[PDB]
Design a protein around this ligand. Sequence first.
Ligand SMILES: Clc1cc(CNCCc2ncc[nH]2)ccc1-c1ccccc1
Lengths: 326, 326
Amino acid sequence: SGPVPSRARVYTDVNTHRPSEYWDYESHVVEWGNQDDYQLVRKLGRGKYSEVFEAINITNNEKVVVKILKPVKKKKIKREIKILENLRGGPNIITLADIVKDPVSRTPALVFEHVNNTDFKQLYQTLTDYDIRFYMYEILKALDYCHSMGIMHRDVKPHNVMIDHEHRKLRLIDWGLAEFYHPGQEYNVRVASRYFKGPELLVDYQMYDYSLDMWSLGCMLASMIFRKEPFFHGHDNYDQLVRIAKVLGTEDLYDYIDKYNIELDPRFNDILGRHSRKRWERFVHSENQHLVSPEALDFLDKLLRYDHQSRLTAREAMEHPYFYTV
Amino acid sequence: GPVPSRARVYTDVNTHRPSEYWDYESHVVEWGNQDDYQLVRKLGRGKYSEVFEAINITNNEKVVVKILKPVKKKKIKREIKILENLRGGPNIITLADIVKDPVSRTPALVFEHVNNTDFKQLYQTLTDYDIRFYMYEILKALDYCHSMGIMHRDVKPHNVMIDHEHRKLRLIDWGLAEFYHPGQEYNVRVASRYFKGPELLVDYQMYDYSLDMWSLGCMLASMIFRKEPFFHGHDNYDQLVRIAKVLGTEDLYDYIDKYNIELDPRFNDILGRHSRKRWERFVHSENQHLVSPEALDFLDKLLRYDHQSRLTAREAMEHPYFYTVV
Ligand SMILES: Clc1cc(CNCCc2ncc[nH]2)ccc1-c1ccccc1
């Protein structure tokens, strides 16, 4: 008849039991403050529908980050703002400080706490096996919190994780794709960045949950311990599933899609092939062995599962032996 | 002639901004189609506008439609520009659309719907706290619009829509609002009689945002003392006399001397001599529950003849009267 329904094993009804105002971002009233209080200093980068700037709040001489949004979709701006407001103050969540709009331009801008970022590549060289544990625990704090608040980030990747290694501070940012979890709801699968996309998205299984973020986090952990960036290197969304199948095997992939009665896209049949399930110790080499341990591999194995229901939740992951040292 | 004056705050916000932001005469107005809106009932009738509750048929959401009698096109452009400039500001009525009826070609402004609680029910059950709360909400609107270089120039109870059930307040009716430019001489035929600042009544044209602070003072006094209106003039000359009966003729002569104001000969036989009355004189059994030393200290700092001596909206927000509000 169609796909088998699914629901989160944790924080299932947190949004249902809350008032309409909290989860309805379309009805949320956005109060745009004056942009004069902020003086833009330099461009920090340029995203798809946003330009980020380092700025100074002239009213208190404090550094801030200003994300000038290309207002391509209003509903999307409202969702992000609402989620940021909802999560404001949460552990390791980027703090939205202000919502402003420049008076002639009338372009929406989000003002955040400033983070002194340590480069992905630069941090990578000096990252110890403990450091991977510590920061992975810090991300888990952010995820367990946002999941407990009925929100799935849906865009977990190293670019969205800001780290100040000098102060051992981590912030989960870029909430633009984030969404309110509602049990039974069917979500758009065109979320997350290709390498971090969960199997559910690639096979077009819409009734996904917070566990999506746990797959993404698994991909990040895999890339870190093994020093293989990205871990699953798809060249497109179809190939992405093949790259996962080359590691997890095609047997468990068919068991997954059968369990949820998923109609596999015709473009898959000719590229998927047949693949054995690979051991996690196969990726261990001389360049990465110092960051790899049985605990790390046991933890990774419990994150990188086809079955979204079978993956550890953020809270279960926090209790894993891998983190006994943090 | 009269000594020049300028605002103590947001003096050159407009000057340092481009021509497009404040030249409303050059602003390009794009009139949408009125067919998206179905009028429900008349909410009231102003001088050059008729307001209606309406339904946006494309989304079944209620909206407010202000049909404007097009006596002057320059004024309509000014309002539209100001509304567009302020759109999204805290407690500012949100302009949602600008439409013309296809056959009538009459200009109409579409705003976000506000459910206004019945004034009579609200007036009797209002408490000391509700006044502090709603006053702070108006201050948010004023500090914001003054920050954007705009003086409302028509602050009065009628232009403050309050939804008590949801504790929502909107400052509306921007038809008399104007861009502040330091040194500019404005038309004094603005605001509503009871709310007209001394500067308007003595024909002192170089006024600023502080005009709105006097008007707010009139509302506050009316609220805490349960006297409506507080200064009950029967005309614009008598209006100054009503103020003089409270503030005293001594300070009135100090004011007009400070700015070298030529007092109209019509004031000669009506002004008289009046002593400075203590604010405690207006306290009675019917209003003593809404009055406090903080309230009287705050009111005293708003109802000043000298427009430069009145608290700015930001200073007013920092007053001890609001120490009990978020
Ligand atoms: Cl300003 C005002 C206004 C109202 C209601 N205004 C009615 C506005 C209206 N009615 C129809 C169209 N617009 C109620 C209370 C207040 C008020 C509340 C606290 C302190 C001072 C004043």
